[PDB]
Design a protein around this ligand. Structure first.
Ligand SMILES: N[C@@H](CCC(=O)N[C@@H](CSC(=S)NCCc1ccccc1)C(=O)NCC(=O)O)C(=O)O
Ligand SMILES: N[C@@H](CCC(=O)N[C@@H](CSC(=S)NCCc1ccccc1)C(=O)NCC(=O)O)C(=O)O
Ligand SMILES: [Ca+2]
Lengths: 241, 241
């Protein structure tokens, strides 16, 4: 198989998505953990001109990750990477075969990206109000099959897309990480433990139980420590509405 | 053989995406145009509970669009619909077969969704400064093959995803529709006419020349009039500095 190199960082939920999918695929791959606390290496724009993590190279000669080759394909954007891995490894069935079930997976990924993800970003990094995030999570939970299972029934890349963010939410809340107020932290912790969110808590447990999560997660406390190194999580800053 | 119904509106670039893809697929389908100036029908949340257009039903008995059946699948989110149409009509080759070229298509869609679409929204609906939108458009332009072609080479759903927005930009600017100032309107019109943006103009021309655009566009002047009906475009209102 043509080589896969993923440029990643422990804190990054977008990178985590692609690590999960690569584990589920059974792929051979290399990871290279960047250090955002130091100057970005001058080679990094060769693998992602937008200066984003994850970055992915595919094919080309086998080279050290810090010496990327011009011959490798440079694949940008985590959701594009998820669909790429699903295309590369059809025997791993990272999407359903049925068109309608595949659409459920794609719909779930779009619902998350369009209505939930920006709320996580704004509540955590800007300290905007928590209620719209809780409303968007309740909407997303309503898209899950009610009786159990994953977004499209069997596990798929839709679950790789979403679990990195939901799995960080619980330990980040408990550690008090984020720019939201104390009041909104209390509200979120009570809501996420309440009966209204029992289905999404089961979904999180089901996704975390898979080896693809265990093998790509540093541990709750270690992930909290990695997130504390993120400059935009301006420590000691909180916003109040 | 299963029925497709698309709930649409002329002004909506998101619905336009799916009309283009259905044309390219050679699908048999029904459209039902909603009227956002009157009360939303009580049946509409049965097809989409987020109150969004487009909405799609698939399968079930043939029924009038205003009497949707519980037996049809209810598909939400325009990009999920595009991928669904590609899956349903494999002989139409609405995505490449090669995995790397497929990833170019997905990347282009993610670049537009994540970095460009929100700039269009800020500038048109809030009147924020135009420079970040021009920067994001230059980035998107840079992702196209420079010597010609569509986003992934051959035409794909990536081009159905992006042309509705780029095609509206030119006539909207010429009509002065959107919350940006005259100064930023002049700036954008000059920029989009300059050699800096020749490649994206070629892209717009190439996408517009296909029958799938012609058969799904009401004409520039008619599309402008339809957009004037949108409340959040606040016709007559402009924000300065
Ligand atoms: N749309 C993109 C988004 C990727 C992204 O935002 N990644 C990083 C942000 S980009 C980043 S960390 N780039 C680092 C560039 C760099 C490389 C090497 C050394 C130093 C810096 C992230 O996880 N932020 C945290 C959050 O939003 O919760 C995608 O889906 O891949
Ligand atoms: N993420 C969604 C976005 C869909 C969306 O925003 N659609 C409409 C907005 S939702 C809409 S128009 N809802 C109408 C609901 C309705 C149905 C029937 C009667 C009355 C109202 C739109 O085109 N807005 C214009 C723009 O953003 O440029 C998608 O990708 O499908
Ligand atoms: Ca439901």
């Amino acid at each position: 198989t043509k080589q896969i190199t993923l440029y990643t960082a422990t804190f990054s939920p977008y990178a985590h998505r692609v690590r999960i999918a690569l584990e589920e695929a059974g792929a051979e791959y290399t990871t290279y953990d960047v250090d955002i606390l130091r100057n970005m290496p001058d080679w990094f724009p060769l693998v992602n001109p937008l200066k984003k993590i994850p970055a992915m190279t595919f094919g080309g000669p086998e080279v050290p990750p810090d010496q990327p080759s011009p011959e490798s394909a440079k694949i940008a954007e985590s959701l594009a990477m998820l669909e790429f891995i699903a295309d590369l490894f059809p025997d791993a069935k990272l999407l359903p075969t049925d068109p309608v079930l595949r659409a459920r997976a794609r719909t779930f990924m779009a619902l998350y990206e369009n209505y939930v993800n920006g709320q996580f970003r704004d509540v955590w990094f800007l300290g905007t109000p928590a209620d719209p995030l809780l409303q968007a999570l309740e909407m997303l939970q309503g898209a899950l099959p009610p009786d159990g299972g994953f977004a499209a029934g069997e596990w798929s890349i839709a679950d790789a897309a979403v679990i990195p963010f939901l799995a960080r939410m619980f330990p980040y809340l408990e550690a008090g990480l984020g720019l939201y107020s104390k009041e909104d932290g209390v509200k979120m912790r009570k809501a996420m433990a309440s009966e209204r969110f029992a289905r999404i808590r089961q979904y999180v447990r089901d996704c975390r139980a898979r080896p693809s999560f265990a093998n790509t997660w540093a541990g709750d406390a270690e992930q909290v420590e990695a997130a504390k190194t993120v400059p935009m999580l301006r420590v000691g800053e909180h916003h109040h509405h």
